[PDB]
PDB file of C-alpha atoms in Angstrom:
ATOM      1  CA  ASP U  20      35.882 -26.111 -18.747  1.00 36.12           C
ATOM      2  CA  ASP U  21      33.883 -29.291 -19.326  1.00 33.27           C
ATOM      3  CA  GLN U  22      30.601 -27.475 -18.641  1.00 36.35           C
ATOM      4  CA  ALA U  23      31.869 -24.075 -19.831  1.00 35.50           C
ATOM      5  CA  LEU U  24      31.258 -24.936 -23.491  1.00 33.45           C
ATOM      6  CA  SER U  25      27.801 -26.351 -22.719  1.00 30.56           C
ATOM      7  CA  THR U  26      26.592 -23.081 -21.180  1.00 32.62           C
ATOM      8  CA  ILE U  27      27.683 -21.055 -24.222  1.00 35.57           C
ATOM      9  CA  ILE U  28      25.912 -23.454 -26.595  1.00 36.35           C
ATOM     10  CA  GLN U  29      22.778 -23.350 -24.434  1.00 36.19           C
ATOM     11  CA  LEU U  30      22.824 -19.539 -24.456  1.00 34.62           C
ATOM     12  CA  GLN U  31      23.234 -19.546 -28.239  1.00 32.98           C
ATOM     13  CA  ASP U  32      20.296 -21.920 -28.650  1.00 33.07           C
ATOM     14  CA  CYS U  33      18.190 -19.777 -26.307  1.00 33.42           C
ATOM     15  CA  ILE U  34      19.052 -16.576 -28.190  1.00 33.68           C
ATOM     16  CA  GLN U  35      18.106 -18.099 -31.553  1.00 35.92           C
ATOM     17  CA  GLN U  36      14.891 -19.408 -29.981  1.00 35.95           C
ATOM     18  CA  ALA U  37      14.026 -15.958 -28.608  1.00 33.65           C
ATOM     19  CA  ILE U  38      14.847 -14.179 -31.882  1.00 31.69           C
ATOM     20  CA  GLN U  39      12.740 -16.683 -33.843  1.00 31.85           C
ATOM     21  CA  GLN U  40       9.645 -15.467 -32.002  1.00 30.05           C
ATOM     22  CA  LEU U  41       8.761 -11.788 -31.673  1.00 31.41           C
ATOM     23  CA  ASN U  42      10.479 -11.616 -28.268  1.00 30.73           C
ATOM     24  CA  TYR U  43      13.198  -8.974 -28.427  1.00 31.62           C
ATOM     25  CA  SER U  44      13.874  -7.702 -24.894  1.00 31.90           C
ATOM     26  CA  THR U  45      14.603 -11.258 -23.747  1.00 32.05           C
ATOM     27  CA  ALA U  46      16.862 -11.623 -26.787  1.00 32.69           C
ATOM     28  CA  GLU U  47      18.494  -8.347 -25.723  1.00 35.58           C
ATOM     29  CA  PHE U  48      19.232  -9.633 -22.221  1.00 32.85           C
ATOM     30  CA  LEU U  49      20.486 -13.003 -23.429  1.00 33.11           C
ATOM     31  CA  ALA U  50      22.773 -11.380 -26.012  1.00 33.35           C
ATOM     32  CA  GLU U  51      24.179  -8.960 -23.421  1.00 33.07           C
ATOM     33  CA  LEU U  52      24.832 -11.806 -20.976  1.00 37.42           C
ATOM     34  CA  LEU U  53      26.460 -14.031 -23.611  1.00 41.61           C
ATOM     35  CA  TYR U  54      28.615 -11.162 -24.903  1.00 42.57           C
ATOM     36  CA  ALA U  55      29.751 -10.385 -21.352  1.00 42.93           C
ATOM     37  CA  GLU U  56      30.463 -14.062 -20.637  1.00 39.58           C
ATOM     38  CA  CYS U  57      32.517 -14.545 -23.808  1.00 42.67           C
ATOM     39  CA  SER U  58      34.890 -11.742 -22.747  1.00 40.74           C
ATOM     40  CA  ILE U  59      37.315 -14.155 -21.065  1.00 40.13           C
ATOM     41  CA  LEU U  60      37.590 -16.225 -24.243  1.00 38.43           C
ATOM     42  CA  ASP U  61      40.277 -15.132 -26.679  1.00 37.36           C
ATOM     43  CA  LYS U  62      39.437 -13.188 -29.827  1.00 38.65           C
ATOM     44  CA  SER U  63      40.575 -16.107 -32.007  1.00 38.89           C
ATOM     45  CA  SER U  64      37.727 -18.274 -30.695  1.00 40.40           C
ATOM     46  CA  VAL U  65      34.700 -18.518 -32.974  1.00 40.27           C
ATOM     47  CA  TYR U  66      32.461 -18.200 -29.905  1.00 39.48           C
ATOM     48  CA  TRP U  67      33.522 -14.588 -29.300  1.00 38.26           C
ATOM     49  CA  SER U  68      32.730 -13.586 -32.887  1.00 37.22           C
ATOM     50  CA  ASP U  69      29.404 -15.434 -32.774  1.00 34.29           C
ATOM     51  CA  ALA U  70      28.416 -13.721 -29.518  1.00 37.14           C
ATOM     52  CA  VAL U  71      29.436 -10.307 -30.874  1.00 34.59           C
ATOM     53  CA  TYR U  72      27.355 -10.894 -34.009  1.00 34.80           C
ATOM     54  CA  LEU U  73      24.352 -12.031 -31.968  1.00 33.72           C
ATOM     55  CA  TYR U  74      24.642  -9.011 -29.658  1.00 33.46           C
ATOM     56  CA  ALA U  75      24.924  -6.612 -32.608  1.00 33.00           C
ATOM     57  CA  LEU U  76      21.886  -8.204 -34.259  1.00 33.56           C
ATOM     58  CA  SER U  77      19.869  -7.907 -31.045  1.00 34.54           C
ATOM     59  CA  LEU U  78      20.873  -4.253 -30.698  1.00 34.33           C
ATOM     60  CA  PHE U  79      19.836  -3.596 -34.304  1.00 36.32           C
ATOM     61  CA  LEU U  80      16.440  -5.241 -33.822  1.00 36.82           C
ATOM     62  CA  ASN U  81      15.650  -3.151 -30.723  1.00 36.88           C
ATOM     63  CA  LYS U  82      15.875   0.148 -32.702  1.00 34.85           C
ATOM     64  CA  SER U  83      19.030   1.140 -30.750  1.00 37.29           C
ATOM     65  CA  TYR U  84      20.912   1.662 -33.995  1.00 37.58           C
ATOM     66  CA  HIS U  85      23.780   3.715 -32.540  1.00 38.44           C
ATOM     67  CA  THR U  86      24.919   1.036 -30.085  1.00 39.25           C
ATOM     68  CA  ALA U  87      24.583  -1.684 -32.731  1.00 40.52           C
ATOM     69  CA  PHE U  88      26.642   0.398 -35.162  1.00 36.67           C
ATOM     70  CA  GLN U  89      29.409   0.920 -32.605  1.00 38.19           C
ATOM     71  CA  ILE U  90      29.453  -2.750 -31.583  1.00 36.23           C
ATOM     72  CA  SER U  91      29.606  -3.917 -35.184  1.00 39.40           C
ATOM     73  CA  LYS U  92      32.321  -1.337 -35.984  1.00 38.53           C
ATOM     74  CA  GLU U  93      34.530  -2.661 -33.164  1.00 39.77           C
ATOM     75  CA  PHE U  94      34.913  -6.091 -34.854  1.00 42.46           C
ATOM     76  CA  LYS U  95      33.488  -5.587 -38.347  1.00 44.00           C
ATOM     77  CA  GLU U  96      36.245  -7.603 -40.045  1.00 42.71           C
ATOM     78  CA  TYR U  97      35.932 -10.760 -37.934  1.00 42.59           C
ATOM     79  CA  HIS U  98      32.518 -12.008 -39.086  1.00 39.89           C
ATOM     80  CA  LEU U  99      30.236 -11.620 -42.095  1.00 40.50           C
ATOM     81  CA  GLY U 100      27.071 -10.954 -40.089  1.00 37.57           C
ATOM     82  CA  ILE U 101      28.809  -8.185 -38.159  1.00 35.49           C
ATOM     83  CA  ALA U 102      29.588  -6.543 -41.507  1.00 35.88           C
ATOM     84  CA  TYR U 103      25.934  -6.973 -42.495  1.00 36.22           C
ATOM     85  CA  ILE U 104      24.766  -5.254 -39.309  1.00 35.21           C
ATOM     86  CA  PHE U 105      27.322  -2.454 -39.744  1.00 36.75           C
ATOM     87  CA  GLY U 106      26.187  -1.882 -43.332  1.00 37.95           C
ATOM     88  CA  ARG U 107      22.515  -1.816 -42.356  1.00 38.20           C
ATOM     89  CA  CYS U 108      23.258   0.629 -39.533  1.00 37.27           C
ATOM     90  CA  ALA U 109      25.194   2.843 -41.951  1.00 35.06           C
ATOM     91  CA  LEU U 110      22.230   2.789 -44.337  1.00 31.34           C
ATOM     92  CA  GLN U 111      19.892   3.739 -41.483  1.00 29.89           C
ATOM     93  CA  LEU U 112      22.131   6.563 -40.211  1.00 30.67           C
ATOM     94  CA  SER U 113      24.409   7.596 -43.157  1.00 30.81           C
ATOM     95  CA  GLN U 114      27.514   7.527 -40.921  1.00 32.30           C
ATOM     96  CA  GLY U 115      30.764   5.808 -41.870  1.00 30.09           C
ATOM     97  CA  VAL U 116      29.476   4.423 -45.176  1.00 28.66           C
ATOM     98  CA  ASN U 117      33.005   4.346 -46.646  1.00 27.04           C
ATOM     99  CA  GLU U 118      34.130   1.767 -44.107  1.00 28.61           C
ATOM    100  CA  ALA U 119      31.079  -0.281 -45.102  1.00 29.15           C
ATOM    101  CA  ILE U 120      32.059  -0.199 -48.777  1.00 25.57           C
ATOM    102  CA  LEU U 121      35.706  -1.096 -48.094  1.00 22.12           C
ATOM    103  CA  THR U 122      34.561  -4.022 -45.931  1.00 24.23           C
ATOM    104  CA  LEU U 123      31.668  -5.333 -48.036  1.00 23.13           C
ATOM    105  CA  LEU U 124      33.590  -5.154 -51.323  1.00 23.08           C
ATOM    106  CA  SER U 125      36.375  -7.264 -49.819  1.00 25.59           C
ATOM    107  CA  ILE U 126      33.968  -9.764 -48.256  1.00 22.25           C
ATOM    108  CA  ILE U 127      31.956 -10.253 -51.463  1.00 25.21           C
ATOM    109  CA  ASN U 128      35.001 -10.379 -53.758  1.00 22.95           C
ATOM    110  CA  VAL U 129      36.752 -12.991 -51.606  1.00 22.98           C
ATOM    111  CA  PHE U 130      33.612 -15.139 -51.369  1.00 21.55           C
ATOM    112  CA  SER U 131      33.122 -15.172 -55.149  1.00 21.77           C
ATOM    113  CA  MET U 141      38.376 -15.179 -40.712  1.00 21.09           C
ATOM    114  CA  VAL U 142      34.824 -16.524 -40.361  1.00 22.02           C
ATOM    115  CA  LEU U 143      32.473 -16.406 -43.350  1.00 20.95           C
ATOM    116  CA  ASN U 144      29.821 -19.142 -43.047  1.00 20.83           C
ATOM    117  CA  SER U 145      27.817 -19.939 -39.919  1.00 22.54           C
ATOM    118  CA  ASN U 146      24.583 -21.661 -38.917  1.00 24.73           C
ATOM    119  CA  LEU U 147      23.151 -18.771 -36.873  1.00 23.88           C
ATOM    120  CA  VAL U 148      19.949 -16.873 -37.661  1.00 25.34           C
ATOM    121  CA  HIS U 149      19.923 -14.025 -40.210  1.00 25.54           C
ATOM    122  CA  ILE U 150      23.294 -15.022 -41.695  1.00 24.49           C
ATOM    123  CA  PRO U 151      23.408 -13.228 -45.065  1.00 27.37           C
ATOM    124  CA  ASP U 152      23.531 -14.909 -48.438  1.00 28.52           C
TER     125      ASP U 152
ATOM    126  CA  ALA B  23      -2.044 -24.387 -59.261  1.00 29.98           C
ATOM    127  CA  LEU B  24      -0.834 -24.891 -55.685  1.00 31.59           C
ATOM    128  CA  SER B  25       2.853 -25.565 -56.385  1.00 27.74           C
ATOM    129  CA  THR B  26       3.377 -21.931 -57.404  1.00 24.07           C
ATOM    130  CA  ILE B  27       1.794 -20.542 -54.227  1.00 20.92           C
ATOM    131  CA  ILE B  28       3.733 -23.029 -52.085  1.00 22.99           C
ATOM    132  CA  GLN B  29       6.976 -21.978 -53.796  1.00 22.61           C
ATOM    133  CA  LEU B  30       6.225 -18.280 -53.327  1.00 22.83           C
ATOM    134  CA  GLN B  31       5.297 -18.826 -49.686  1.00 21.71           C
ATOM    135  CA  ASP B  32       8.628 -20.609 -49.190  1.00 22.28           C
ATOM    136  CA  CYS B  33      10.324 -17.649 -50.876  1.00 19.36           C
ATOM    137  CA  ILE B  34       8.601 -15.347 -48.377  1.00 21.17           C
ATOM    138  CA  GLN B  35       9.817 -17.554 -45.530  1.00 18.09           C
ATOM    139  CA  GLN B  36      13.380 -17.274 -46.833  1.00 17.91           C
ATOM    140  CA  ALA B  37      13.111 -13.518 -47.458  1.00 17.43           C
ATOM    141  CA  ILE B  38      11.709 -12.644 -44.029  1.00 16.92           C
ATOM    142  CA  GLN B  39      14.259 -15.011 -42.476  1.00 18.66           C
ATOM    143  CA  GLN B  40      17.001 -12.959 -44.176  1.00 16.49           C
ATOM    144  CA  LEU B  41      15.916  -9.830 -42.242  1.00 15.55           C
ATOM    145  CA  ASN B  42      14.712  -8.336 -45.533  1.00 14.48           C
ATOM    146  CA  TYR B  43      11.646  -6.129 -45.075  1.00 15.46           C
ATOM    147  CA  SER B  44       9.516  -4.547 -47.832  1.00 14.78           C
ATOM    148  CA  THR B  45      10.680  -7.475 -49.972  1.00 11.79           C
ATOM    149  CA  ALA B  46       8.050  -9.648 -48.289  1.00 11.36           C
ATOM    150  CA  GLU B  47       5.541  -6.798 -48.674  1.00  6.22           C
ATOM    151  CA  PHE B  48       4.855  -7.339 -52.380  1.00  6.28           C
ATOM    152  CA  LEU B  49       4.981 -11.133 -52.202  1.00  9.78           C
ATOM    153  CA  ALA B  50       2.600 -11.164 -49.220  1.00  9.12           C
ATOM    154  CA  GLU B  51       0.308  -8.854 -51.189  1.00 12.91           C
ATOM    155  CA  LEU B  52       0.477 -11.279 -54.130  1.00 12.33           C
ATOM    156  CA  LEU B  53      -0.331 -14.331 -52.016  1.00 14.64           C
ATOM    157  CA  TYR B  54      -3.217 -12.508 -50.323  1.00 15.82           C
ATOM    158  CA  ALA B  55      -4.710 -11.484 -53.669  1.00 14.68           C
ATOM    159  CA  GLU B  56      -4.195 -14.932 -55.213  1.00 16.57           C
ATOM    160  CA  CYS B  57      -5.627 -16.890 -52.273  1.00 16.41           C
ATOM    161  CA  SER B  58      -8.562 -14.567 -51.564  1.00 16.47           C
ATOM    162  CA  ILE B  59     -10.388 -15.932 -54.619  1.00 16.87           C
ATOM    163  CA  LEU B  60      -9.711 -19.682 -54.437  1.00 18.40           C
ATOM    164  CA  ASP B  61     -11.215 -20.135 -50.964  1.00 14.32           C
ATOM    165  CA  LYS B  62     -12.159 -18.344 -47.756  1.00 14.13           C
ATOM    166  CA  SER B  63     -11.795 -21.246 -45.292  1.00 16.32           C
ATOM    167  CA  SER B  64      -8.939 -23.408 -46.618  1.00 17.46           C
ATOM    168  CA  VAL B  65      -5.666 -23.809 -44.738  1.00 17.37           C
ATOM    169  CA  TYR B  66      -3.815 -21.930 -47.479  1.00 15.55           C
ATOM    170  CA  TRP B  67      -6.173 -18.970 -47.026  1.00 13.28           C
ATOM    171  CA  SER B  68      -5.457 -18.718 -43.288  1.00 11.39           C
ATOM    172  CA  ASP B  69      -1.737 -19.195 -43.944  1.00  9.48           C
ATOM    173  CA  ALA B  70      -1.775 -16.407 -46.521  1.00 13.71           C
ATOM    174  CA  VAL B  71      -3.675 -14.091 -44.167  1.00 12.68           C
ATOM    175  CA  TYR B  72      -1.163 -14.754 -41.380  1.00  6.84           C
ATOM    176  CA  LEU B  73       1.834 -14.145 -43.645  1.00  3.91           C
ATOM    177  CA  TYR B  74       0.268 -10.951 -44.975  1.00  2.46           C
ATOM    178  CA  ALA B  75      -0.393  -9.722 -41.434  1.00  2.25           C
ATOM    179  CA  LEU B  76       3.184 -10.468 -40.347  1.00  2.50           C
ATOM    180  CA  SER B  77       4.635  -8.681 -43.384  1.00  2.00           C
ATOM    181  CA  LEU B  78       2.492  -5.591 -42.765  1.00  2.00           C
ATOM    182  CA  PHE B  79       3.284  -5.630 -39.032  1.00  3.16           C
ATOM    183  CA  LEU B  80       7.054  -5.940 -39.491  1.00  2.00           C
ATOM    184  CA  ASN B  81       7.246  -3.090 -42.049  1.00  3.75           C
ATOM    185  CA  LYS B  82       5.964  -0.250 -39.820  1.00  3.38           C
ATOM    186  CA  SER B  83       2.403  -0.563 -41.173  1.00  3.12           C
ATOM    187  CA  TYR B  84       0.207  -1.167 -38.126  1.00  2.00           C
ATOM    188  CA  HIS B  85      -3.055   0.625 -38.945  1.00  2.00           C
ATOM    189  CA  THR B  86      -3.660  -1.823 -41.829  1.00  2.00           C
ATOM    190  CA  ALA B  87      -2.420  -5.077 -40.282  1.00  2.00           C
ATOM    191  CA  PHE B  88      -4.608  -4.220 -37.278  1.00  2.00           C
ATOM    192  CA  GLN B  89      -7.868  -4.609 -39.202  1.00  2.00           C
ATOM    193  CA  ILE B  90      -6.443  -7.319 -41.491  1.00  2.00           C
ATOM    194  CA  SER B  91      -5.772  -9.513 -38.468  1.00  2.00           C
ATOM    195  CA  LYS B  92      -9.003  -8.330 -36.803  1.00  2.00           C
ATOM    196  CA  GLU B  93     -11.210  -9.725 -39.574  1.00  2.00           C
ATOM    197  CA  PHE B  94      -9.737 -13.265 -39.419  1.00  2.00           C
ATOM    198  CA  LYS B  95      -8.226 -13.442 -35.928  1.00  2.00           C
ATOM    199  CA  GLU B  96     -10.371 -16.450 -34.963  1.00  2.00           C
ATOM    200  CA  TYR B  97      -9.055 -18.691 -37.767  1.00  2.00           C
ATOM    201  CA  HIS B  98      -5.337 -19.033 -36.954  1.00  2.00           C
ATOM    202  CA  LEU B  99      -3.395 -18.533 -33.731  1.00  2.00           C
ATOM    203  CA  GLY B 100      -0.636 -16.599 -35.491  1.00  2.00           C
ATOM    204  CA  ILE B 101      -3.150 -14.096 -36.845  1.00  2.00           C
ATOM    205  CA  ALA B 102      -4.396 -13.557 -33.287  1.00  2.00           C
ATOM    206  CA  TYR B 103      -0.804 -13.119 -32.084  1.00  2.00           C
ATOM    207  CA  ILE B 104      -0.105 -10.504 -34.762  1.00  2.00           C
ATOM    208  CA  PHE B 105      -3.406  -8.789 -33.938  1.00  2.00           C
ATOM    209  CA  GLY B 106      -2.551  -8.654 -30.236  1.00  2.00           C
ATOM    210  CA  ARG B 107       0.927  -7.256 -30.809  1.00  2.00           C
ATOM    211  CA  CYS B 108      -0.466  -4.617 -33.170  1.00  2.00           C
ATOM    212  CA  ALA B 109      -3.145  -3.790 -30.581  1.00  2.00           C
ATOM    213  CA  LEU B 110      -0.394  -3.213 -28.022  1.00  2.00           C
ATOM    214  CA  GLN B 111       1.514  -1.057 -30.508  1.00  2.00           C
ATOM    215  CA  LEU B 112      -1.495   1.077 -31.488  1.00  2.00           C
ATOM    216  CA  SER B 113      -3.260   0.984 -28.078  1.00  2.00           C
ATOM    217  CA  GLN B 114      -6.580   0.025 -29.676  1.00  2.00           C
ATOM    218  CA  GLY B 115      -8.947  -2.945 -29.661  1.00  2.00           C
ATOM    219  CA  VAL B 116      -7.491  -4.654 -26.604  1.00  2.00           C
ATOM    220  CA  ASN B 117     -10.681  -6.425 -25.439  1.00  2.00           C
ATOM    221  CA  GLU B 118     -11.235  -8.499 -28.592  1.00  2.00           C
ATOM    222  CA  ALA B 119      -7.579  -9.573 -28.552  1.00  2.00           C
ATOM    223  CA  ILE B 120      -7.969 -10.582 -24.903  1.00  2.00           C
ATOM    224  CA  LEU B 121     -11.039 -12.665 -25.735  1.00  2.00           C
ATOM    225  CA  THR B 122      -9.375 -14.360 -28.722  1.00  2.00           C
ATOM    226  CA  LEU B 123      -6.229 -15.275 -26.827  1.00  2.00           C
ATOM    227  CA  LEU B 124      -8.178 -16.433 -23.767  1.00  2.00           C
ATOM    228  CA  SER B 125     -10.152 -18.747 -26.052  1.00  2.00           C
ATOM    229  CA  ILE B 126      -6.896 -19.970 -27.614  1.00  2.00           C
ATOM    230  CA  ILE B 127      -5.407 -20.721 -24.182  1.00  2.00           C
ATOM    231  CA  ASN B 128      -8.613 -22.494 -23.148  1.00  2.00           C
ATOM    232  CA  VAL B 129      -8.353 -24.773 -26.202  1.00  2.00           C
ATOM    233  CA  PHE B 130      -4.909 -25.867 -25.002  1.00  2.00           C
ATOM    234  CA  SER B 131      -6.324 -26.212 -21.481  1.00  2.00           C
ATOM    235  CA  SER B 132      -9.359 -28.216 -22.610  1.00  2.00           C
ATOM    236  CA  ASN B 133      -8.898 -31.852 -23.601  1.00  2.00           C
ATOM    237  CA  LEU B 143      -2.753 -25.013 -34.317  1.00  2.00           C
ATOM    238  CA  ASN B 144       0.212 -27.153 -35.378  1.00  2.00           C
ATOM    239  CA  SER B 145       1.412 -24.848 -38.167  1.00  2.00           C
ATOM    240  CA  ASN B 146       5.215 -24.615 -38.216  1.00  2.00           C
ATOM    241  CA  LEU B 147       5.483 -21.312 -40.080  1.00  2.00           C
ATOM    242  CA  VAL B 148       8.181 -18.765 -39.302  1.00  2.00           C
ATOM    243  CA  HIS B 149       7.915 -16.475 -36.249  1.00  2.00           C
ATOM    244  CA  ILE B 150       4.967 -18.507 -34.906  1.00  2.00           C
ATOM    245  CA  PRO B 151       5.030 -18.295 -31.089  1.00  2.00           C
ATOM    246  CA  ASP B 152       4.886 -21.463 -29.011  1.00  2.00           C
TER     247      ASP B 152
END
C-alpha cells in the first residue's frame, strides 16, 4: 500500500508524458495497463475516474472511436473529461447524442463528483 | 509589434492543448502570413513554421504540411519531426527525412532548446 500509490502516480506521469509527444501507441498501452490496475480500487477513489478518463482519451486519439465511446459511456457522470470524450465521440458517430446533451447541460449548468483536475486535455 | 504575435502563439498553444483542431488552423495560417514578411531566419519565423506544420499535420492535411516542413526542415528540430511523421504517413520523401534526423542526432552526439508544445525530447 505504501508503494501502491507511487506506482499509480508514476503511470499517470508517464501517460501524460507520452500524450504530450506524438506517441500514441505507447500511450495506449500505458492507459490500458493503468485502467486494468485501478480495477481493484473502489469507484469512489479519484484514481479510478482519472484512469478511466485517461484510457478513454487514449482510445479517442487512436481513431478507435467506438471503444472510446463505450468506455466513456460506462462512467460518463463521474468525471468531466469523460463527458467531453463521450460528447466528441457522439459528434464523430451521431450515436447517443441525447445522453450527451442531458449530461453536458447538467455539467455546464452546475459549474456556472469530480469536476476540476490537473490532467492533460481537461476541458475549460 | 511582437507582443501580439507572442500572445497569438500562446493562444495557439492553449487551443491545441485543449484538443481543439481546425481552431489552430486559422491562427497558424495568420502567424505564418504575419511572420513570413518580417524575417526569414529569425527564431519567431522558425517557431511560426513549426506551429503551422503541426496544425496542418494534426488536421488531416498531410500533402501540404509535407512540403511546408520540407522547405524549412533544416532550421528547427520540430519541423524535421513533423516532416518525418508526415513522410511516414504519406510514404514519400523518406531519404531526406533520414538525412535531416541523422544530422540532428549527430549534433547531440557531437560536442534546439525550444520548449514549445508537442516537441519531442
